[PDB]
Amino acid sequence: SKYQCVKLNDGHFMPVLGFGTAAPAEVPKSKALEAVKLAIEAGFHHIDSAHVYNNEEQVGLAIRSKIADGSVKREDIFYTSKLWSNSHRPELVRPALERSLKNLQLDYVDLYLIHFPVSVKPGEEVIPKDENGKILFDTVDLCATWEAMEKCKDAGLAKSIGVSNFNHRLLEMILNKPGLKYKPVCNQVECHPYFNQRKLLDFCKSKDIVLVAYSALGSHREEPWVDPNSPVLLEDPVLCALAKKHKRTPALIALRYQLQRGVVVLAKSYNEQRIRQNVQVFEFQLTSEEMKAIDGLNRNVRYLTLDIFAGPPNYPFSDEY
């Protein structure tokens, strides 16, 4: 019942290694169920999902099954969900959380995040478009969205609340909000050796906000969300060399890198072998020279731009950080 975790700025604890559940559309949802169960069996205690992934029914079932058969206790599973952009309006935040909880059949989520800062029109469609294919953007004061999130925490529906894909300006906007009750516990953003977020990371550290890295292994590289011409992280010569030296894998080196720099890292895999392999990140350590070697791979390569949401002022990736 023991594993590595970090204390959040709201007193709760977050397991430093999380399991990602997002998969491509061409992948059946039944795969999420089997994958999450194998992840729990392997030793993952942190599970990351979201309403927009359209898999919470399956992920929730995996969790309930592992709890129901004695494999794990609810307090030993840290589950994260995310508020999708079609529910940024204050009065729609709690209903969105409650909808996810119903799909999951869980009483609460350990963490609820604002998934993306750009808002879209209310409704069932996650990406609402008009008759001419234009995304239907909505104007919403995120500070108001946050107050609705804070209320979800006070209601016990979400143990901790945080954000995702927020930049320096957006975080400051929340942190400088008059009457702020709860700082976000984290900022889940893309982070790997080719885009190490050094600057944003230091900022988060200075405010005791945990940076949670997604696409830590180089992302799924699926179109039209990621450009195929982008470099392949796991094929990097330095990572391959270090892997050989430590008798590990490029993926493990990339994951250990994050843990040693203070980042909570996610890792998605639907392959039984690789799922069990990623938990090996707690079996070795990198020296200072090796960590510096990895820092040197940084090359401003952002795999997930989500530019279909570019235009509105809240688009997060235009600023330096």
Ligand X SMILES: NC(=O)c1ccc[n+]([C@@H]2O[C@H](COP(=O)([O-])OP(=O)(O)OC[C@H]3O[C@@H](n4cnc5c(N)ncnc54)[C@H](OP(=O)(O)O)[C@@H]3O)[C@@H](O)[C@H]2O)c1
Ligand Y SMILES: C[C@]12CC[C@H]3[C@@H](CCC4=CC(=O)CC[C@@]43C)[C@@H]1CC[C@H]2O
- List residues with catalytic annotation: 53
Beta carbon of residue 19, minimum distance to ligand Y (angstroms, whole number): 14
Among 137, 182, 282, 317, contact with its own copies (rule: CB under 8 A): 282
What's the gap between Cα 25 and its chain centre?
18
225 is an interface residue for ligand Y by CB under 6 A: yes
Give the binding range for its own copies (CB under 8 A) out of 31-39, 150-158, 170-178, 279-287. 279-287
32 in helix, strand or coil?
A: helix
52 is an interface residue for ligand Y by CB under 6 A: yes
User: How far is the CA of 313 from the CAs of 86, 119, 139, 245, 262, in angstroms?
Assistant: 17, 10, 10, 46, 30
Among 5, 6, 22, 61, contact with ligand Y (rule: CB under 6 A): 22
Tokens, residue 64: 């309930």
Cα separation, 120 vs 132, whole angstroms: 16
Task: Please say whether the beta carbons of 283 and 133 come within 8 A.
Answer: no
Cα angle 214-16-183, degrees, rounded to a multiple of 5: 80
Q: Which residue is nearest to ligand X (CB)?
A: 20
Binding-site size for ligand X (CB under 6 A) equals 28
306 is an interface residue for ligand Y by CB under 6 A: yes
Cα angle 163-169-171, degrees, rounded to a multiple of 5: 30
Q: Going residue by residue from 7 to 36, which x/- string records binding to ligand X, judged by CB under 6 A? A: -------------xxx--------------
Q: Which of 165, 291, 301 is nearest to 233 (CA)?
A: 301
**Comparison of 219 and 290: residue with beta carbon closer to ligand X:** 219
Task: Classify strands 109-114 and 158-164 as parallel, antiparallel or unpaired.
Answer: parallel
**Residues that bind ligand Y in the complex, under the rule CB under 6 A:** 22, 25, 50, 52-54, 126-127, 225, 304, 306
**Residues that bind ligand X in the complex, under the rule CB under 6 A:** 20-22, 48, 115, 164-165, 188, 214-220, 234, 249, 251, 266-271, 274, 277-278, 304
**Residues that bind its own copies in the complex, under the rule CB under 8 A:** 1-7, 9, 13, 75, 198, 201-202, 205-206, 208, 260, 262, 282-289
